[PDB]
Design a protein around this ligand. Structure first.
Ligand SMILES: CC[C@H](C)CN(C[C@@H](O)[C@H](Cc1ccccc1)NC(=O)O[C@H]1CO[C@H]2OCC[C@H]21)S(=O)(=O)c1ccc(N)cc1
Lengths: 99, 99
């Protein structure tokens, strides 16, 4: 689709058989999801945002269907204000900015 | 233009003197710029993201040129690590997400 920006670009994602709303966030290098259970090994990591640093759990090679488009990549789980889809997965679904 | 997301979507903006590099950020509701001493009235505000909140000064009706496109609107100013062009101005320069 083409998504305009008068409203937040929120879309439905499917991860681990669950449906969630997430924000298409071109300002995010990484994909960061609110606290949830994902299977498999994870690694403790830290990331910084506008307000400072948080601790996250890094899950590698996780499938997510974003608005009908398949991605398989790194997902960070931690205390983000909202689920964000960052550039690591936006590139996989062929997302660009246009003006 | 079309901007892929392999790299951070940084572009040149102008606000007065001062050309700056800023992120075209679909995840930011409002534009937030690094500390700078703008003229005019303003109001304090707190904006939240990963890590928590920062305090900013909200200036209204500030003209900004973004990649040669004219925009005018709210510009938040505070201790952000990166200059961020948010949705309030992205719509003004005709910017969409496409995939
Ligand atoms: C609530 C949604 C989202 C977290 C809001 N943020 C915009 C976001 O694009 C920031 C923009 C941002 C970029 C870089 C530093 C700080 C902020 N990115 C971000 O936090 O990304 C993190 C995930 O990947 C990593 O890559 C960048 C930092 C990490 S924000 O910076 O906090 C923000 C919040 C409110 C306004 N008005 C403007 C900006």
């Amino acid at each position: 689709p083409q998504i305009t920006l008068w409203k937040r670009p929120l879309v439905t994602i499917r991860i681990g058989g669950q449906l969630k709303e997430a924000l298409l966030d071109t300002g995010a290098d990484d994909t960061v999801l609110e606290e949830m259970n994902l299977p498999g090994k994870w690694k403790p990591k830290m990331i910084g945002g506008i307000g400072g640093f948080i601790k996250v759990r890094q899950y590698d090679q996780i499938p997510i269907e974003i608005c009908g488009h398949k991605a398989i990549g790194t997902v960070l789980v931690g205390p983000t204000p909202v689920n964000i889809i960052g550039r690591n997965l936006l590139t996989q679904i062929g997302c660009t900015l246009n003006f």
